Amino acid sequence: GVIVIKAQEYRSQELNREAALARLVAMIKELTTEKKARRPTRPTRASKERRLASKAQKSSVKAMRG
RNA sequence: UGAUGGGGUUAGCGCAAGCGAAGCUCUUGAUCGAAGCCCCGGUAAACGGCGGCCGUAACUAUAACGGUCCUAAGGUAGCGA
């Protein structure tokens, strides 16, 4: 994790300061990725749908017995 | 090409003055007038040229997509330090 990059030649060294600076700073941002898409914010609308989806199959299992 | 009108000079009409035929001049030029030009299309293995801005998907990251502007058209196939 010695994370290296060669901020090569320029007409002002400080230019690559702000270059390598915004590079590492943003790198930390890009590597924020809190589980790549995970908040996860799992809605409740899809939960009732599948729940009622389990309901339809429930009553049909009133099939064969006795 | 040359219709006209306009200027100069001077028989005759007239004793100043003036007028002015006619001649000849100077000038104006109506009119005639083709291609080109304009309009019109076709033409890119003719010369050539072949975009912006901005938002958006289960926080993250990108944006298939969406909005709007602009252009004659908005770079496909393939390829790419």
Side-chain angles (χ1 to χ4, degrees), chain A residues 6-55:
Chain A
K6 194 170 298 179
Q8 228 149 343
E9 53 70 46
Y10 263 141
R11 318 204 170 298
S12 181
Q13 170 195 40
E14 294 66 58
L15 300 182
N16 264 326
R17 168 253 175 172
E18 58 197 307
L21 257 290
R23 189 232 72 74
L24 187 67
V25 172
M27 185 287 295
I28 303 173
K29 177 178 66 176
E30 308 315 313
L31 286 189
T32 304
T33 48
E34 296 164 29
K35 289 170 65 179
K36 313 167 188 62
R38 193 290 308 172
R39 156 56 86 185
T41 314
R42 194 271 170 275
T44 174
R45 305 333 307 154
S47 74
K48 271 76 171 189
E49 300 178 314
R50 63 145 301 295
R51 195 176 64 179
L52 250 296
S54 288
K55 173 62 208 69

